[PDB]
Each structure stands twice: as C-alpha cells, then as structure tokens.
Design a protein around this motif. Structure first.
Motif, short mmCIF file in Angstrom:
data_model
loop_
_atom_site.label_atom_id
_atom_site.label_comp_id
_atom_site.label_asym_id
_atom_site.label_seq_id
_atom_site.Cartn_x
_atom_site.Cartn_y
_atom_site.Cartn_z
N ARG A 58 -41.15 -2.82 -35.39
CA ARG A 58 -40.25 -2.16 -34.46
C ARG A 58 -40.67 -2.27 -33.00
O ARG A 58 -39.83 -2.52 -32.13
CB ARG A 58 -40.09 -0.68 -34.85
CG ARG A 58 -39.07 0.09 -34.02
CD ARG A 58 -37.71 -0.61 -33.99
NE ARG A 58 -36.70 0.20 -33.31
CZ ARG A 58 -35.52 -0.25 -32.90
NH1 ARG A 58 -35.19 -1.52 -33.09
NH2 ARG A 58 -34.67 0.57 -32.31
N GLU B 21 -40.02 -5.76 -31.94
CA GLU B 21 -38.59 -5.98 -31.84
C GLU B 21 -38.06 -5.40 -30.54
O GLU B 21 -37.31 -6.05 -29.81
CB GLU B 21 -37.87 -5.34 -33.04
CG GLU B 21 -36.36 -5.35 -32.92
CD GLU B 21 -35.67 -4.77 -34.15
OE1 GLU B 21 -36.08 -3.68 -34.60
OE2 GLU B 21 -34.73 -5.41 -34.65
N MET C 281 -36.21 -7.03 -38.55
CA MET C 281 -35.78 -6.79 -37.17
C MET C 281 -34.27 -7.01 -37.08
O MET C 281 -33.81 -7.88 -36.35
CB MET C 281 -36.50 -7.75 -36.21
CG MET C 281 -38.02 -7.61 -36.20
SD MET C 281 -38.80 -8.70 -35.00
CE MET C 281 -40.54 -8.30 -35.26
#
Ligand SMILES: [Zn+2]
Ligand SMILES: [Zn+2]
Ligand SMILES: [Zn+2]
Ligand SMILES: [Zn+2]
Lengths: 179, 180
Positions: free
Chosen positions: B82, B85, B119
């Motif tokens: 995360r 991303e 992602m």
C-alpha cells in the motif's frame, strides 16, 4: 506438430472480472511463423448457468445477444473443462506444449481467464506474449495514416475476432514493419 | 504536449511468478511522451515483505534478487504494498491523468496480474489497453533475427534499469524494425 507454429486464441466473457465473470466462448487456430492459417481449432460456446448470464451488464447483453452467442451458450453441452479438453486435443496435433507464446489482441486479459478457468490450456503456452495490439498502439501514435487501412468489425465473435487479429498483424507487417 | 498523451511505463520484481503465492518486492515507473521522450522518473521502491515470504523464493529468485541487492533492500524497507502503491500514484498524478495511458513495459501482462491482486488502485490508473514491447522482439525473432543482436539486455531484473531498458529497446525497434 511443429515447435515453430503459433497458437492464436480469443475468448468472449460475461464481463471483465475473472473472479465473478465466466468464459462463454473460445476459439483457437494455428498459423506458421509467417501468419498462414494452417488449421482452425474448435469454436465453442461455453455453457454457463442462466444465473451467470443474468449478471451481464448492458454492453455484454447487447453484444452477446446480437452475435447469437447467448442462445448458443444456453444450448451448449460443453462447460469450461470440456471446452478446454477439446481445444487441447486440437492444439496437440499442431504445436508442442510450452513452445508458442499466447497470440492475440489485448491478450493479457484473456490469459487472466485462462489462468482461472482453463489452467491446463494456459500452461500449454510458453511464458511469452505476442500481442498484436502493440503495433496498433504504436501506429496510432507514430503513423496514424495506416490506421484507417484496416478496420476491426468489433462483433466480439471469437473465431472471426482471432482470424481478424491474424489478418491485422499481416496488415501491419506490410504497412508498419521494415523487413 | 497534452498530458493525456503521456505514457506510463512500469516494471515490477516479484518473489515468484504466481500472484496467489508470491509478492511484489520492487516497483519502478517513469513517464514518457508519445514519442518515448522520458519526461520524469518515478520512485524506485523496494517493497517490504516478511522473511517468511522471502524464504519461499526458489533458486532462481534467490540468486537473482540477492545478486542485485534487492533482498537486503526489501528487508530494510519500511514501505509495504500500500505505501509503495500510494507513493507511485503520488508521482503519476503529477504527469498523467487517470485511465488514459495503456500499461507500458515488457511481457507486461505478468506485472498487471500482480497489480490487480496487490495494487488495484494503481492498476485502475491505467487505461484497459496494453503496450507490450515484447511483441516487436517476438516478430523480429521470426522475421528479422539479425536486429536482435543489435540490442543487448542485462537481464539483472532491477526494476528501474529494466523499465528504462524497455523504453530504449522500443526506441531501437522504431529505428531498425519500424517503417515510419
Ligand atoms: Zn473476441
Ligand atoms: Zn470480445
Ligand atoms: Zn524487471
Ligand atoms: Zn523481473
């Protein structure tokens, strides 16, 4: 069977998500290294439940009913596995396993469905990709003039689509590739 | 030029080839205009993953990712899926609008599978389309083998070096294999 032959494949699905959508049509064919179609594989409407078909969105309903695929799917007696096996029986006669890259258009999307519903068939291909769309995308940006030279019908009919992809690549070989 | 015509190039390195059992360990992106001019380089991020996950890598992956120093970077990384991303999106939003650029790279469908899984927001930033440079190599391999020797790849599997190499490879084919 010749390791130099290419395996071309196209699928039609109820939608774009492998986790919820299903394969409703599959078509394959084999060409030599010079794009000559050596033989057409089976064009199979893959049976799926009415419940599954009822989940298709407007675009998919319009598209797959106009081609007559929906009716063929409901009358089909061949599910994912039966269609996968029938396709493999055909391919084994023309190309050895793990030799040909997957050939088609925006083929990564089709491969996702193969990974989930027809893993044996997916494994029959070599790791590599041969996506004809690369040439169209490059021409769109570097030589737009040739784009109007070849027209896609967009009927989303598996066999017509894959044969069209072969014809499209042949078109770009002549008009976009420098041999 | 119009930003809507900019291309997003991306390359990942993973612990293996299966999205269900493997994880992303490196990501790199860059943006070019329609004619391959590199406008900006995105962040190169070693994506943190557990030692348990790393311990599952096969011989090829262990050799490859330790030789590049990626394994050590992964272990010391403080940016997971995360975070990596979000950092990548922070960069891309400054150069290309969402849903405009096809995903650009080599054998890019494999990378996309991992984006879909780990992602999805970044995957969604791309247009549906694919721009896979490997198509040209596969065609040259069969119709004009000679030019293949004119471009040498390092095969070190380092994300940023790889994606820059992919752009260079495409430029090479535009000059020696494409009829403009
Ligand atoms: Zn189709
Ligand atoms: Zn279709
Ligand atoms: Zn790489
Ligand atoms: Zn790699």
């Amino acid at each position: 069977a010749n390791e130099n032959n290419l395996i071309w494949i196209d699928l039609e699905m109820t939608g774009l998500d492998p986790e919820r959508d299903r394969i409703i049509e599959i078509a394959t064919l084999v060409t030599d290294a010079n794009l000559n179609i050596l033989a057409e594989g089976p064009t199979i409407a893959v049976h799926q439940s009415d419940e599954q078909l009822a989940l298709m969105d407007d675009w998919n309903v319009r598209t797959h009913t106009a081609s007559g695929l929906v009716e063929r799917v409901k009358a089909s007696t061949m599910g994912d596995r039966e269609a996968e096996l029938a396709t493999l029986e055909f391919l084994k006669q023309w190309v050895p396993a793990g030799k040909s890259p997957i050939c088609g258009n925006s083929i990564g999307q089709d491969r996702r469905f193969l990974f989930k519903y027809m893993p044996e068939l997916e494994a029959y291909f070599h790791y590599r990709y041969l996506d004809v769309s690369t040439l169209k995308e490059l021409a769109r940006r570097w030589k737009p003039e040739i784009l109007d030279g070849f027209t896609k019908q967009g009927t989303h009919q598996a066999m017509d689509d894959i044969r069209e992809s072969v014809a499209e690549l042949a078109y770009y070989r002549e008009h976009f590739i420098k041999l």
